[PDB]
């Protein structure tokens, strides 16, 4: 068990098209999509809804009561996708989530670590898909070096046994 890590190379202008292809070709149970700002989370959730997919969104510039209600509704499976900022200081691990998408690649290795699991736990099935632009090159290099990991280029076919619970 362990999270399979890939990256797709894109320009900012291509990210939505790339994300649309991931939604139509991945066997997502639940997904979490991370952005680097509150403004981008809002813009992206509006876009995903226009693509035709359901999503909730949470960020730092929301009222506490709204943020908590949205997270609890997502955990209960009222929707299949969540768009958010780095709100989980100890990390995140809701069981139905088999796919994590870094729509914006993080700056810090500890942020990256918190997105793809929770502190003091073993490895679990899943995918972590990173959308990488040329401006993310330094952060990609340093996060791979700091974690001692390899974020591989996204393959032509993703083996379902790597992220689909009890199937293929």
């Amino acid at each position: 068990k362990g999270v399979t890590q890939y990256y797709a190379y894109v320009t900012e202008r291509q990210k939505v098209h790339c994300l649309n292809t991931l939604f139509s070709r991945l066997q997502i149970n639940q997904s979490i999509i991370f952005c680097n700002s509150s403004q981008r989370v809002e813009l992206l959730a509006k876009k995903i809804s226009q693509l035709g997919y359901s999503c909730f969104y949470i960020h730092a510039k929301m009222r506490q009561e709204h943020r908590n209600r949205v997270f609890h509704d997502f955990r209960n499976g009222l929707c299949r996708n969540l768009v958010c900022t780095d709100l989980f200081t100890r990390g995140i691990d809701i069981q139905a989530v088999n796919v994590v998408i870094n729509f914006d690649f993080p700056k810090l290795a500890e942020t990256y670590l918190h997105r793809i699991g929770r502190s003091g736990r073993f490895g679990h099935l899943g995918l972590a898909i990173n959308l990488i632009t040329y401006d993310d090159r330094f952060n990609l290099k340093s996060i791979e070096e700091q974690l001692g990991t390899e974020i591989k280029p996204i393959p032509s076919n993703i083996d379902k046994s790597l992220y689909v619970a009890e199937y293929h």
């Binding site: 900012e12 202008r13 939505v16 070709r25 981008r40 996204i154």
Partner: protein, 37 residues
Amino acid sequence: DLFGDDIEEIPDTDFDFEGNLALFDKAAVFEEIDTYE
């Protein structure tokens, strides 16, 4: 860097992951980073 682009203009075909991966030579770019460090 036009983040927003409606479904009307989004190409009907799947995103070309393979063709776009060729635009980033990861090993050479990392060597370039180390050379100007």
